[PDB]
Amino acid sequence: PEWIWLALGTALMGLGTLYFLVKGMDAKKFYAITTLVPAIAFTMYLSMLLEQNPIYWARYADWLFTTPLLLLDLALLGTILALVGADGIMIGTGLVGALWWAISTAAMLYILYVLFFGFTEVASTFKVLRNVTVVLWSAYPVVWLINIETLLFMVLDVSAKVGFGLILLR
Amino acid sequence: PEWIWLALGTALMGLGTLYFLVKGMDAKKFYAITTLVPAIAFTMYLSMLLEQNPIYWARYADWLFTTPLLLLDLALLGTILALVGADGIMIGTGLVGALWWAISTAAMLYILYVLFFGFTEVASTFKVLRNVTVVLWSAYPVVWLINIETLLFMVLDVSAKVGFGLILLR
Amino acid sequence: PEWIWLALGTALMGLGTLYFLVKGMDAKKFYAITTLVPAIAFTMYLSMLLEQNPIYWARYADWLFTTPLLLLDLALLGTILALVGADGIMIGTGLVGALWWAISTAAMLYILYVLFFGFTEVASTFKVLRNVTVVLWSAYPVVWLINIETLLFMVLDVSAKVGFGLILLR
Ligand SMILES: *C/C=C(C)/C=C/C=C(C)/C=C/C1=C(C)CCCC1(C)C
Ligand SMILES: *C/C=C(C)/C=C/C=C(C)/C=C/C1=C(C)CCCC1(C)C
Ligand SMILES: *C/C=C(C)/C=C/C=C(C)/C=C/C1=C(C)CCCC1(C)C
């Protein structure tokens, strides 16, 4: 069941890498960072594609890595390290749990709140970015607690990133 | 048995994060770094709290991470990377063993000796720091070889860090 | 069978660390980096020494770590991050497989091609380096697909690194 959605997903991700790379062929820093997310996402996305116990983690792993990257990206334009700890915390939990979350959410707020504090066309970018990220991530804890698991999540990352990447080109 | 001590421990660690964070609300760099240790320590400390095989590693994992941080912190005020290798070496061993140490100790001396070479109120700080660290870590290999396992270790980290953090505020 | 070769290997690696360290007692950066490879190689090399499933990974793990280091070293004199992803990809695969490669090779070309683009006595160094690396790594995918597994690989790392390190002193 979960698979229908997943195959879709991996496909899209790869594209991202192709596109960005292609496109890419201060400014110097961005291409790399933004390119790193889709590619990483793609490999782990396909990794995942390729009952309950095993599938879960991959997401976490990919998520882990793309997260700081995403956050770094955002901040780029201790703070930094703090965020990853949280994320690391989070994966521990979920995996711990079906195979804790309380603190994860605490940590999430931190990142979110810092973002808020932090930023306050580049301006445009961060403005949109902050809200984009906020709402985007909400599905995680929301869904977590909540065909669907996979579905939703799929949307989210692609939405999150591919959309996100586009902003940079913009 | 081990638990009595452990619950105690996690509690204290969390405090650290609260306090520092709170307090925090060149100087810029320190808060982050110092704040990162207690928080990380707390999460993994609680992770551990939450027969022989499983418990062991967590310590290692947390230890791993707080170590370079601690060392980085100290140096902050290749060198760097070398140290983590050692630490990584160390975890490999202990986990390998009950679930090698010889080289670990070799590596430990390196860090210790470098510290010595390195530093030779900031001055005060490093002076105390070096000896603090030296003696502190000695229990590890000492204890390792040696209720008690957990007990001692508990003391050590808190002693090591919470005390350590305090120095920075100072 | 594999062991004969392996014991040989670990021995040589350790030497490297001793030598470099010893020797070492812009220039500042190199010693560290170059010293880090042999030592790391040695620990994991011995780790490996100390039927099919278990042995494999260690190599990967060590490989993982020495790789970016090696690459970083080369570049030192996003780019950076990209490369590790690939490597990470690669380990996933091989381990996935006997315990994917297609993309690994794709990634390898990237590193290789970037090198090419990148560099185009320091000059000498990179010139030789690029070809050295290219041919060296070819055995990996070659052998992978291909007493021998262990044999060949052994040669390669030592050849790769110990030789490589020497270049720096040079
Ligand atoms: C490309 C994917 C990205 C950028 C994913 C980011 C994910 C998070 C911040 C997930 C957080 C989670 C928690 C709050 C812990 C338990 C529930 C989770 C796992 C969904
Ligand atoms: C907050 C905790 C910290 C900063 C811990 C640091 C720990 C070490 C340097 C442990 C080293 C160990 C060895 C020498 C290998 C086998 C014996 C160990 C594991 C205790
Ligand atoms: C000191 C050892 C070093 C620097 C090793 C570097 C290794 C690689 C770049 C290995 C790549 C591999 C693939 C192309 C994936 C499946 C086949 C492998 C595993 C050999």
Please measure the distance between the N-terminal and C-terminal CA atoms of chain A and give it in whole angstroms. Answer: 36
- Rounded Cα distance between A50 and C100, Å, is 9
Class of residue B115 by CB neighbours under 10 A (exposed 0-12, middle 13-18, buried 19+): buried
Supply the range of the domain harboring residue C42. Answer: 1-170
Q: Residues 6 or more apart from A168 whose CB is under 8 A from it?
A: A30, A34
Closest residue in chain B to residue C14, using alpha carbons only: B103
Residue C28 C-alpha to ligand 3 middle, in angstroms? 29
Q: How far is CA A136 from CA A86, A158, C118, in A?
A: 17, 10, 38
The closest alpha carbon to A42, from A73, A69, A6, belongs to A6
* Angle CA A49–A50–A56, to nearest 5: 55
Nearest residue by C-alpha to atom 2 in ligand 3: C63
Q: Residues 6 or more apart from C169 whose CB is under 8 A from it?
A: C20, C23
Coil, strand or helix at A157: helix
Q: Residues 6 or more apart from C126 whose CB is under 8 A from it?
A: C74, C77, C118, C119
- Quick check: CB of A9 below 6 Å from ligand 1? no
Looking only at Cα atoms, what is the longest distance across chain C?
46
Residue A59 C-alpha to ligand 1 middle, in angstroms? 9
Closest residue in chain B to residue A82, using alpha carbons only: B36
* Residue A23 burial (CB count, 10 A): 13
- Rounded Cα distance between C80 and C160, Å, is 19
How close does chain B come to C81, measured CA to CA in Å?
17
Of C82, C89, C100, the CB nearest to A36: C82
Backbone interruptions in chain B following residues (C to N > 2.5 Å): 25, 50, 77, 99, 120, 146
SS3 sequence of chain C: CCHHHHHHHHHHHHHHHHHHHHHHCCHHHHHHHHHHHHHHHHHHHHHHHCCHHHHHHHHHHHHHHHHHHHHHHHHHCCHHHHHHHHHHHHHHHHHHHHCCHHHHHHHHHHHHHHHHHHHCCHHHHHHHHHHHHHHHHHHHHHHHHCCHHHHHHHHHHHHHHHHHHHHHHC
Residue corresponding to tokens 């504090």 = A117
- Rounded Cα distance between B76 and B86, Å, is 19
Give contacts of B35 with chain A, Cβ < 8 Å.
Answer: 78, 82
Q: Residues 6 or more apart from A103 whose CB is under 8 A from it?
A: A89, A93, B43
Of C36, C47, C50, the CB nearest to B81: C36
What approach was used to elucidate this structure? Answer: electron diffraction
Class of residue B35 by CB neighbours under 10 A (exposed 0-12, middle 13-18, buried 19+): buried
Give contacts of C43 with chain B, Cβ < 8 Å.
Answer: 85, 89, 92, 103
Angle between helices A52-76 and A27-49 (to 10 degrees): 170
Give contacts of B100 with chain C, Cβ < 8 Å.
Answer: 50
B162 DSSP assignment: I
Of A135, A140, A162, the residue with max ligand 1 atoms within 8 A of its CB, to mutate for a pocket test, comes to A140
Residue corresponding to tokens 């970037």 = C114
Of B78, B89, B96, the CB nearest to C32: B78
The answer to whether the CB of A78 falls within 8 A of the CB of B36 is yes
Q: Would you call A36 and C81 a contact, using CB atoms and an 8 Å cutoff?
A: yes
Q: Residues 6 or more apart from B53 whose CB is under 8 A from it?
A: B98, B99
Please measure the distance between the N-terminal and C-terminal CA atoms of chain B and give it in whole angstroms. Answer: 36
The answer to whether the CB of B93 falls within 8 A of the CB of B104 is yes
- Rounded Cα distance between C60 and C94, Å, is 9
Residue B37 C-alpha to ligand 2 middle, in angstroms? 15
- Quick check: CB of A90 below 6 Å from ligand 1? yes
| Neighbors of chain A by Cβ distance (3+ pairs < 8 Å) | B, C
The closest alpha carbon to C90, from C107, C113, C66, C109, belongs to C107
Of A82, A100, A103, the CB nearest to B32: A82
The answer to whether the CB of A66 falls within 8 A of the CB of A91 is no
Give contacts of A47 with chain C, Cβ < 8 Å.
Answer: 92, 96
Q: List the alpha helices (DSSP H) in B25-162.
A: 27-49, 52-76, 79-98, 101-119, 122-145, 148-158
Element (H, E) at A147: none
Amino acid at A1: P
| CATH number of the domain bearing residue B124 | 1.20.1070.10
Q: How far is CA A130 from CA A62, A63, A120, in A?
A: 21, 18, 10
Q: In residues, how long is chain A?
A: 170
Class of residue C98 by CB neighbours under 10 A (exposed 0-12, middle 13-18, buried 19+): exposed
The closest alpha carbon to C138, from C160, C164, C161, belongs to C160
- Quick check: CB of A56 below 6 Å from ligand 1? no
- Rounded Cα distance between C143 and C113, Å, is 21
The closest alpha carbon to B81, from C29, A14, A114, C76, belongs to C29
Residue A156 C-alpha to ligand 2 middle, in angstroms? 40
Give contacts of C41 with chain B, Cβ < 8 Å.
Answer: none
Residue A137 C-alpha to ligand 1 middle, in angstroms? 7
The closest alpha carbon to B73, from B122, B16, B25, B9, belongs to B122
Looking only at Cα atoms, what is the longest distance across chain A?
46
Q: How many domains is chain A partitioned into structurally?
A: 1
B2 DSSP assignment: T
- Quick check: CB of A105 below 6 Å from ligand 1? yes
